[PDB]
Amino acid sequence: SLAGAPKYIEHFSKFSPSPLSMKQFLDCEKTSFTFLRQELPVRLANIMKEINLLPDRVLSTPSVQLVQSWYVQSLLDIMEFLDKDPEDHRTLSQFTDALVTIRNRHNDVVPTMAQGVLEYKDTYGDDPVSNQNIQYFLDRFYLSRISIRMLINQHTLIFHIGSIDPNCNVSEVVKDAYDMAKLLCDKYYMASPDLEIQEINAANSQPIHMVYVPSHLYHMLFELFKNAMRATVESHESSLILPPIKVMVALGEEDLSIKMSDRGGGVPLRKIERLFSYMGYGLPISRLYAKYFQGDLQLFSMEGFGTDAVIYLKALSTDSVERLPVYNKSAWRHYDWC
């Protein structure tokens, strides 16, 4: 009773995704339904059109085809709601059930796509042109996915504000991530570095809080602690005294910056880019979480000494706007030294 999926994909891919600010999220169920039965199809269709620009070699892999098939079914699942009445309580409850089913369907997207990359390399061998396309695509695909999960989680949790903490204590999240990383480091190495936190609240020399999704911040910090701890222990195999991991949390007028400093011996500059290369997606996905609300995650090493990692977040909820890829000419097109 639905049209073929390509007709829906072509229809909804003409629209641009609509980015929301953290303030908008933070600040009804019928309104959410009527918004999402347009917006989720727009976001699904825009990235499905980009999948189709991948090299034939990558698109031919079974795991990429599988993920594509999930996106198709999820789009069709929502098309079932196009003619349904928001005033009918049953529409709203069925819609929430459908979003839960979509979220579960897509639970394993990240490792399934990674298997697709491995299939491409195993079947054909990799080549730099395809690899550059894959890198460009996967950043956008995984950020798109983060944004779809955000919309679904907000709706299902609401019907904290959903997953958003309006008073997230950043140092508490740092400590939670440290604690969990320490459990893992202690398991494998029987030791771990200590934590030192310093806060710099420039305008109010007050604990630092923000509006944020704590799970996203935790995810980033946990990945950074795992790397910093492993570096510290493995670079100190002959020492019983481990240098601590030092975290600075700074609150400025526009940025809330979190620096994690280790004395793990570092890595040469040549190898920094590889750390964000898909060709263990912990670091690239962590950086996407930072970018999702107009932040960033940057690494700076001193080979022979150690590494600084900085999470840059927007301090203000009004500056914290979704960063969403859009399928258009610039995107389509995107697919000199001696």
- Give the residues lining the site for its own copies (CB under 8 A): 16-19, 140, 200-203, 248, 250-255, 257, 259, 265-266, 268-270, 296, 298, 300-305, 308, 310, 312, 322-326, 328, 330-331, 334, 336-338
Q: How many residues does the chain have?
A: 338
Q: Considering beta carbons, is residue 98 or 251 the nearer one to its own copies?
A: 251
Question: How far apart are the C-alpha atoms of 166 and 213, rounded to whole Å?
Answer: 9
Choices 59-67, 129-137, 173-181, 299-307; region in contact with ligand P35 by CB under 6 A: 299-307
Q: Considering beta carbons, is residue 143 or 309 the nearer one to ligand P35?
A: 309
Q: Of 45, 79, 98, 309, which one interacts with ligand P35 (CB under 6 A)?
A: 309
Q: What is the DSSP string of 118-185?
A: HHHHHHH---HHHHHHHHHHHHHHHHHHHHHHHHHHHHHHH--BTTBEEEEEHHHHHHHHHHHHHHHH
Sheet holding 306-314, edge to edge: 195-201, 245-251, 255-262, 306-314, 296-302
CA angle 80/321/105 to nearest 5° reads 35
Q: Is 304 annotated as a binding residue?
A: no
Choices 59-67, 164-172, 248-256, 263-271; region in contact with ligand P35 by CB under 6 A: 263-271
Q: Considering beta carbons, is residue 228 or 242 the nearer one to ligand P35?
A: 228
Q: Is 229 annotated as a binding residue?
A: yes
Does position 228 interact with ligand P35 (CB under 6 A)? The reply is yes
CA angle 281/303/231 to nearest 5° reads 50
Residue 220 makes CB contacts below 8 A (sequence gap 6+) with 286, 289, 290, 297, 311
HSE, side-chain direction, 13 A CA sphere, residue 235:
21
Q: Which residues have a catalytic role annotated?
A: 219, 223, 226-227
Q: Is 305 annotated as a binding residue?
A: no
Cβ pair 105, 73 in contact under 8 A: yes
Residue 236's CB: how many other CB atoms inside 10 A? Answer: 18
Q: Is 282 annotated as a binding residue?
A: yes
Question: How far apart are the C-alpha atoms of 194 and 262, rounded to whole Å?
Answer: 11
Choices 36-44, 93-101, 202-210, 220-228; region in contact with ligand P35 by CB under 6 A: 220-228
Choices 124-132, 155-163, 178-186, 230-238; region in contact with ligand P35 by CB under 6 A: 230-238
304: alpha, beta or left? (left if phi > 0; alpha if psi -120 to 50):
left
Q: How far is the CB of 149 from ligand P35 (least distance, A)?
A: 24
Q: Is 226 annotated as a binding residue?
A: yes
Q: Is 281 annotated as a binding residue?
A: yes
The count of residues interacting with ligand P35 (CB under 6 A) is 17
Question: How far apart are the C-alpha atoms of 180 and 202, rounded to whole Å?
Answer: 29
Q: Considering beta carbons, is residue 116 or 264 the nearer one to ligand P35?
A: 264
What are the binding residues for ATP? 223-230, 262, 280-283
What are the binding residues? 223-230, 262, 280-283
- Please report, as ranges, the residues that interact with ligand P35 according to CB under 6 A: 224, 227-228, 230-231, 234-235, 262, 264-267, 275, 299, 301, 307, 309
